Structure formats: C-alpha cells, structure tokens
Design a protein around this ligand. Structure first.
Ligand SMILES: [Zn+2]
Lengths: 136, 49, 79, 59, 126, 192
RNA sequence: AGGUAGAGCUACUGGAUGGCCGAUGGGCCCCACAGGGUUACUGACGUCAGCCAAACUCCGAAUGCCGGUAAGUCCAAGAGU
RNA sequence: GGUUCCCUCAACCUGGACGGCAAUCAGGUGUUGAGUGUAAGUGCACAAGGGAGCUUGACUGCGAGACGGACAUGUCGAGCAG
RNA sequence: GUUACGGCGGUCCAUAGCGGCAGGGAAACGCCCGGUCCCAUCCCGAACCCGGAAGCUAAGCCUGCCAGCGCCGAUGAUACUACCCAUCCGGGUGGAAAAGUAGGACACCGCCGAACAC
C-alpha cells in the first residue's frame, strides 16, 4: 500500500471538495486512462485493490501507471468515547480527487482487453469514471 | 544567586545612586564604573557596595 | 488521553494606523510592526521596536526606493 | 614591516665544498654558513665516510 | 589565445571604494543650506564638488587640472592645499556658509585631510 | 506539402465579456482572436460545428481562410481552450500568416509497425517541434518499429522529415522507447 | 496597506509518479594487494514530462476597512457626538 | 551594551605531509540557500552577520504628539538643558 | 557647440542584468615604479598611506553589434468573486486573475568638469 515516508504535519484539516481539476486531466504516459467524474477521497486501499484488478486481467504484458498518491491523512478517535479531549490519531491516507482528474493509465497491445481491464478497476472505486484515450 | 542585585555608590559623597545586576562568578570583584552623580553634579567613579 | 496544546498569547494589534493621504501631526505613530517591512522615508523615524512615527506634520505617502517599501510625509501647504 | 616582532635578519654568505659561493640574506646570526651539497653539486640537477671505507679496507 | 582567470586589482579597488562610499552616504546628504563636499582622489590629481542632493545639482567645483594649481612647485600635498583654498573662495562667493564633508570613501588623512584643513581656515566651517 | 486553405466565415463581435461569450456558445459559436503581425487583435465568432469539422480531418494546426465581413485573411490555428469534462472548444487563438513565412509548430508522431513479439513499445514524447512554411506544415509524422530488438531509444533526431521542414527541439528527445515486455512478477512490484 | 479565493513551483520548505545518463555498493572474474569489465542487480547528483500542501509562496483578485471629495435623504433618518 | 573604521558568507570544483566527505593553505564559481545568545514569526548582504581601537548613555531634570484600551495595566516618541 | 571623455545623482531600480564578438588612450580614469617621510599588517608597502612617471591599453572603464540565459508582457478566454434570480442543477449584471501566446528589450534622464571649436 502507498504510504508517504514522512509528513511535516500529521494531523490536518479535511481536503476541500469544490471545483474541477486544474492539472492532470490528460493522458500522458500510457494509451488508455480512467478519468474521474465525481469528488471523493480515494483511500490507499482502493488503489491497491484497483491496480491488482488490472494486473490479473492483462496477465503478463503491459505497464500500469498510478497518477495519484495518498498523501493527506484522516484521523479517527478511539471508539466509544464522548466528544472532546483532543483530536484523533491518523488512521488512513486518502487522495483528493476532483472531476476531470485522470487516475490510472495502461499500455497494452490490443484494445478489447485494455478496456475490459480498466472496467474491472472502476468497480472498486467509490465514484463514477470513464475510459479515455490519448487521441482527440 | 549567580546574578544578584548590586548598588553602586559614589566614591566622593558615598551616595547610592544606581542599582544593577552582575554575574558574581564571571566578575568576583566589586564592580568599578564611572556614572553621573547628581549630588556632585559631575561624572564620578562609582563602586559596588 | 488529553491534549498537550492549548496555549497562545495576546494579540498585539499591529498594522498600519495611518493610510495614504491622511494628515498627521508630528510624533504621531504611523505603522506598528515587528521587522522593517516598511522602511522610514523623509520626515519619518524608526522607533525602538521598529515603529514608524512622523517627524513633521504633513500627509502620509507610501513609496518605493530600490525595492524597499517606504513611508514618506509630504508638507501640505498653508492656505 | 613591524619593528620589534620579527626575527633578527642578517646578510649571509653560502659556501659549498665545490667552491660555489652565494651572497643571500637569512636568519643565521653568524652571517655565513657552509653547505655540503648545492645546486651544482647534486647529481639530480646535473644528471650525473661509510662508502669511503668500502674503498679503504677492500679497495 | 589568452583569457584572464580572476579579477584585476583595479577592478577590486574600484568596487570596494564605491562599496564603502555608499555606506558613508547613508548618513551625510546635501541640502541647499548645507551642501555636501564630495572629494575624488586619484594617483595624480584630486577633485572636489559642492552638491545639492535635493536637485542633484553641483553648486561649486575646484580641481587640480587647472593651470594655476599645476604651477605649484610642491608635492601632491601642496596641490591639495591650493585646491582646498579655491573651494572656500567659490563656495562663499555662491553664498554658502556651512557644508558637510563627504570624504568620498577614502581614509581621512594625508591628501584628503590636508584639503579639508586648508578649506577650514579659509572660511568654510564643517 | 501544399495544403488548400479551409474557408470559414467569421463575424466581428459586438459585445465581449463572460456574459456575452456564454450566450455565444449557447448559439453554436466559438469566440476567437486574430492577432499576429497585424498588431491589432480582432474579436471574431466562428461556427461551432464547422470549426470542429475542420479540426477533425485536417489536424489541430489547420491553416484557415477567414471571411471577416468581406475581407479574406490567411490564419493559422495557434491554441485551443477545451473543457476537461464536456470536451468543448471554449476559445481559439488565431495567428495571421502569409505565404513564404516560417512558423514554429508542434506536430504529432505516430508509431506504426509490429516489433519483436517479446517487447513492449512505450512512447515518451507525444509531439515534437518543427519549423516549416506557413502552408507546408505536415499533418502528422510517422515512425516505424518493424523488427526493432530489445532496448532501443528512437530519438527525435532520427524522425524522417519532409523537405523544407527543420527540427527545432533538441535531437536528444526520447520519442519512442522499446523495452522487454514485463512479466507477471514484474507487474506485481510496480506501484506496491 | 494587505495575502485570503484562485493559481504556481529549475521561485523557497516538505510530499511525490514515470523515463534517460550514471558516482556510490552486493559482488564475479582483474591469480593475493593496486589493477577493467561483468550482472532480471542497489542506485546519489543531474536532466525530460505529468502532480500536491491550514502552519509552502516568484504571484494574486472580488468584497471589506481607513481618508478626501461632490451630491442625495433633509416640515426626517426621528441620524451622529 | 555605546561609538568610529574595515570585511563578506554557506555550498561546490581543482591542487596540496601525515589528513580521510569534513581540521589549516591556495585558485575559481558562488546575491544569499550561512549566521543572527535562546522557540516561532517579521526582518537583516545597504548589512541588524564577521573583526579591531577607545569607552560606560545599562545617565540626571523633562517631555510636544500618538498606539492600545471596561478599569487598573502596557508601548513608541522628536526635542530642550546639565 | 562637439566628443568612443571623467565625476555626482535619479527611475514604482534588471525593458537597465549575465554571456558572446569587434574596437579607444588628446586631457582625464587605470594598471605601473619605489618605501626616505605622515600612515599600516592579528605575519605580509598584497590592502590603507605617501613620493613619482620608464611601460601599456593586456585587464578595470568606455563604444558598436548579437535575443543563447535571465527580465518585462498585452488583447481575448478561463478560474474566482460582490449583489440578485433559482424548490435539491444552474444562471444574469459588475469586477477580474495565475499560467500560456503575440511581442518588448543589450536602458533612459539631470547637474558639473575636461580637450577641441567659437
Ligand atoms: Zn557623588
């Protein structure tokens, strides 16, 4: 699972979920990609579950790129306690995704398997998404 | 007290004019310094008490 | 469990007291600041804690001199 | 050049066993000194009692 | 070909003097009532000016380039005294009574001090 | 390469802003700007469906011929503003050109051919810069990967260019990278 | 006069994806030491492309606030001090 | 601490007995990435940073005009005389 | 009045900087010669200071041309936003960026002084 080596500040405010993506909205490395259509926090566990779904489908050949990193932490206070007395300890790492952002990428010789492999991964993410190509 | 309070008295009229602090480990001796004395009306040598 | 935070200090009310165009007397405080974000100009002096005060009556004017922000006092003319 | 801090400096004279002589200034108080090898004497520059005993007892 | 590697001594000397002349000017400045006396010293001559910094204009000026100063039979210090007296004549003619000495970024003493002391007894007070 | 310029009708806008541009797009139009060596920009409007037809077939760097209320002008497409989501054309920068003039243009490179079966072809640089005549810009550039073996770098200096076309970008751009096809064990260690 | 919204990063402090070149290292052979390559290898610095931040900023609004000025309301706001 | 005068770092490259990544020497690039007694912030290369000579204003009587403020507190200050 | 000339200053202090090529020594600005005298080195006449004029424009400085690196930078469009419509989408009036593009740019101005001329 993707985890940053270190962060200056361990307890942070929630990332804002307004607006569309400014950068990262085009496919740069591979030939096919997955473009988001909704706001969400993509946890580092849904990325691992979504890039193993691509690996199983294409088997041997091809390359996969992950363009988003789970940097920003979210806290969770101990169970069954009243409100107050501090802020909870961090538990999971998320990535702030806005509509238009391209999440994954793939290079594979044939198209039918490539579009099927990327569909297997949209079903693991908590948002709607679509498959985009390098062409205009 | 490392830095105790000390009082500087004029040599001539012996009036106590000023009070300050000095480190008694760095400066084990009585501080000697020239300061203005209102009674004498001029700058006179002052010494710690 | 508890929190080890919870301290703070009183707000020091810094900022600019007289803005551009205001007519001031002599010795009147213009800017309260920590460093020299603004530098003294003509007829303006710097206090002990980097306060800027007027050295002569006039109207405040902000300028720049070699990339340095300065505060100047211009002598409004008698009727 | 400060006055009372530098070592006392003397015009000297250098003599070598080959007859080559100099005239330089050094810190030697005598004003002269003898050297057993100089620029002209040394084989490395020119390219050319223990060893005297080899030719003495044996020859 | 040829290509110099470092900085000449003249280049180092020039920037170092202007470095320590702008440090001087953070205090002294010229006014119409109290103009600034600026001195430029070289290995051959010495120049003075009387500058009003509000307008950036020169009030009076004297120099050793003049033929009268060249007639002096003394050494360089003798030329400074002549120049120092010629600036008190022209400044007081223009209506100037008090000045401030801008030593130009040179050490005060020798040719600079001889010029100042010659202009002090000649009428200019500073 | 000689390209017959595409004729497009342009109207000079009466009102500009963000309220007038949104209304223009609601009527199947696109705002445009015509600057260049004329040195006085013209604010135009273009048909949305006719502009998209020209870009679809003749590429992004299409040469145009605008009829600005009875005056003929030769123009070149310089830039486009495309919505990330709705995938529109929100704007278009147009540069005036004349025949016999050299312009700097980015054209696309295509990878055709099948290499050794145990290799994966990865294209690093999508486009490269050239310097061609105003009416002689190639629509696309092609490279061939046929029998290319193992790890080779196909560089931007080895692209075959037509006559009158000069490479502008440095000749050390890695355009196409052919490498050994990753195995199943090499897939599971990439991105963990 | 700011430094938020936005945006930007070879403009600083940190996070961080994929290429290219490659000192350092596991080493193997250079018979032992110095002695060059060798390797699905470990890869600093650099460089090409795409990114992120309340306690990042080369930048940077709209409003709000301070002052001047010309009017408006003016048998009233039933104002301000 | 006061004043007067002078100076420019950190990092990297190259050459040097012990000596190496790093001690002291030398040449070059280097505009602030070093440093500022002590946290952080605003500043400081014009230096507020580095070095040296003299010295006690780390004063006496005062203080126009202001900042901030429930009140009591708190803060800045040109200038006059000894 | 002219000048490939010397100083003192400016400008919302790089449109002025870095780098490259080619040129100048009339007076000045410099390197340069020397340490007897005022003065100086935490050692060193290298630097500060003084007394000079054998040599040279090789450097500093000055002049002309280059858009490679830095720097400035529109119009239009977008992000954002005050107020107002809008029953969970969104829109109207006003303001309006950052980035990018066309381009600009190898500074401009003021006061003294020199040599030549009048
Ligand atoms: Zn007394």
């Amino acid at each position: 699972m993707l985890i940053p080596r270190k962060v200056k500040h361990r307890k942070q405010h929630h990332p804002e979920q307004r607006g569309i993506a400014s950068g990262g909205t085009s496919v740069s490395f591979g030939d096919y990609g997955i473009q988001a259509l909704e706001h969400a926090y993509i946890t580092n566990r849904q990325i691992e579950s979504a890039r193993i779904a691509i690996n199983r489908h294409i088997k041997r050949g091809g390359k996969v790129w992950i363009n988003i990193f789970p940097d920003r932490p979210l806290t969770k206070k101990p169970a069954e306690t009243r409100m107050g007395s501090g802020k909870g300890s961090p538990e999971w790492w998320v990535a702030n995704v806005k509509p238009g952002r391209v999440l994954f990428e793939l290079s594979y010789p044939d198209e039918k398997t490539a579009r099927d492999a990327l569909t297997r991964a949209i079903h693991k993410l908590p948002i709607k998404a679509r498959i985009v190509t390098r062409e205009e | 007290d490392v830095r105790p309070k000390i009082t500087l008295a004029c040599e001539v009229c012996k009036h106590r004019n000023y009070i300050t602090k000095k480190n008694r480990r760095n400066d084990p001796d009585r501080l000697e310094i020239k300061k203005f004395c209102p009674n004498c009306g001029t700058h006179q040598p002052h010494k710690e008490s | 469990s508890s929190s080890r935070n919870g301290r703070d200090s009183a707000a020091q009310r810094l900022g600019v007291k007289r803005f551009g165009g205001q007519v001031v007397k002599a010795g009147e405080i213009l800017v309260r600041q920590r460093g020299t974000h603004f530098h003294p100009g003509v007829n303006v002096g710097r206090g002990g804690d980097d306060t800027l005060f007027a050295l002569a009556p006039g109207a405040v004017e902000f300028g720049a001199k070699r990339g340095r922000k300065t505060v100047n006092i211009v002598p409004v003319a008698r009727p | 050049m400060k006055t009372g801090i530098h070592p006392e400096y003397v015009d000297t004279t250098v003599q070598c066993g080959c007859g080559h002589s100099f005239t330089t200034r050094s810190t030697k108080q005598s004003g002269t000194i003898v050297v057993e090898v100089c620029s002209q004497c040394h084989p490395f520059y020119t390219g050319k009692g223990r060893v005297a005993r080899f030719e003495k007892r044996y020859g | 070909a040829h290509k110099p590697v470092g900085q000449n001594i003249s280049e180092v000397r020039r920037n170092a003097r202007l470095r320590r002349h702008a440090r001087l000017r953070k205090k002294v400045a010229g006014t119409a009532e109290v103009p600034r006396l600026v001195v430029n010293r070289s290995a051959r001559h010495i120049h003075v000016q009387l500058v009003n910094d509000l307008n950036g204009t020169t009030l009076a000026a004297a120099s050793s380039i003049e033929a009268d100063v060249r007639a002096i039979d003394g050494d360089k210090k003798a030329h400074s005294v002549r120049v120092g007296q010629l600036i008190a004549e022209r400044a007081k003619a223009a209506g100037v009574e008090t000045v401030v000495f801008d030593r130009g970024g040179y050490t005060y003493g020798g040719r600079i001090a001889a010029l100042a002391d010659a202009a002090r007894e000649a009428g200019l007070k500073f | 390469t000689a390209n017959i310029p595409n004729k497009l009708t342009a109207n000079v806008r009466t009102r500009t802003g963000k309220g007038a541009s949104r209304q223009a797009r609601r009527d199947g139009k696109v705002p445009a700007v015509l600057y260049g060596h004329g040195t006085d920009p013209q604010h135009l409007e273009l048909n949305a469906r006719d502009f998209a037809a020209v870009l679809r077939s003749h590429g992004t760097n299409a040469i145009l011929t605008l009829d600005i209320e009875g005056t003929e002008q030769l123009a070149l497409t310089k830039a486009l503003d495309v919505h990330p989501i709705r995938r529109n054309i929100q704007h278009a920068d147009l540069l005036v050109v004349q025949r016999g003039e050299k312009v700097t243009v980015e054209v696309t490179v295509l990878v055709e051919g099948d290499a050794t079966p145990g290799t994966l072809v990865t294209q690093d640089a999508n486009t490269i810069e050239i310097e061609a005549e105003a009416l002689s810009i190639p629509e696309q550039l092609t490279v061939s990967v046929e029998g290319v073996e193992a790890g080779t770098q196909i560089t931007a200096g080895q692209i075959s260019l037509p006559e009158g076309v000069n490479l502008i970008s440095d000749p050390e751009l890695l355009v196409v990278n052919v490498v050994e096809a990753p195995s199943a064990e090499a897939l599971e260690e990439e991105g963990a």
